[PDB]
Design a protein around this ligand. Structure first.
Ligand SMILES: CNc1ncnc2c1ncn2[C@@H]1O[C@H](CO)[C@@H](O)[C@H]1O
Length: 164
């Protein structure tokens, strides 16, 4: 059912995350970590204190799809073992050195075709698939977008529910 997911998403903030490459999303899905640029890292740490849950919704550039969504379980961390990210054009192993711990809620894909009815009021009521990396998605739009994803049998929400 959706009671568990709705509980997780009650009073959540939502952010569109754009990856240039599939490799880092595969790494992140397995390991439960993500890193962003400094501009977005500040917003995510502010949000992590502001919010009961902070949800990252992933889309690989040019894929036409979202690849899943995850909940921050930590503020950005520096100083851990390096994550061997596939670094894009001219980015440093310290340009995204801040590491967020994340718990995946859904690792299954959602094609942009299934979310075409949803617009983000905080991006001029454009369809939610449209957005800059780190674009914040308004509460109800983000909630409905997350509810569109198919159930993921690899995920157990018990840990997340306990972390809250
Ligand atoms: C793990 N962290 C990341 N992995 C892959 N692409 C990223 C990324 N963080 C930011 N990007 C993207 O790479 C570009 C930064 O130069 C932007 O277009 C972002 O959308």
């Amino acid at each position: 059912g959706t009671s568990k997911l709705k509980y997780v998403l009650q009073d959540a903030r939502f952010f569109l995350i754009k990856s240039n490459n599939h490799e880092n999303v595969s790494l992140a899905k397995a390991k439960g970590v993500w890193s962003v640029l400094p501009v977005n890292e500040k917003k995510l740490n502010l949000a992590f204190r502001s919010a009961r849950s902070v949800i990252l919704i992933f889309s690989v550039r040019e894929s036409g799809k979202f690849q899943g969504f995850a909940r921050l379980s930590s503020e950005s961390h520096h100083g851990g073992s390096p994550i061997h990210w596939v670094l894009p054009a001219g980015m440093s192993a310290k340009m995204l050195g801040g590491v967020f711990k994340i718990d995946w809620i859904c690792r299954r894909e959602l094609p942009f075709t299934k979310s075409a009815h949803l617009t983000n009021p905080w991006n001029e009521h454009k369809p939610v698939k449209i957005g800059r990396d780190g674009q914040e998605i308004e509460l109800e739009c983000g909630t409905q977008l997350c509810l569109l994803f198919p159930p993921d049998e690899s995920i157990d929400l018990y840990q997340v529910i306990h972390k809250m």
